[PDB]
Swiss-Prot record:
Paired cysteines (S-S): C7-C20, C27-C42
Protein name per Swiss-Prot or TrEMBL: Low-density lipoprotein receptor
Subcellular location: Cell membrane; Membrane, Clathrin-coated pit; Golgi apparatus; Early endosome
Encoding gene (name): LDLR
Family: Belongs to the LDLR family.
Entire protein: shown range: 66 to 104 of 860
Self-association state and partner proteins as the record states: Interacts (via NPXY motif) with DAB2 (via PID domain); the interaction is impaired by tyrosine phosphorylation of the NPXY motif. Interacts (via NPXY motif) with LDLRAP1 (via PID domain). Interacts with ARRB1. Interacts with SNX17. Interacts with the full-length immature form of PCSK9 (via C-terminus). Interacts with PGRMC1 and TMEM97; the interaction increases LDL internalization.
Length: 42
């Protein structure tokens, strides 16, 4: 399959680091992410 990054069911990546985080912190308004990608348009 050729892959490295991996997350859980209710989780999603951020940006460069691709840090996986819980949907609970999606489109909310926090820099919790590693690259603040969660707050880049939402
Ligand atoms: Ca967040």
């Amino acid at each position: 399959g050729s892959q490295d990054v991996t997350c859980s069911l209710g989780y999603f990546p951020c940006g460069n680091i691709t840090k996986c985080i819980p949907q609970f912190w999606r489109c909310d308004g926090q820099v919790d992410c590693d690259n603040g990608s969660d707050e880049q348009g939402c």
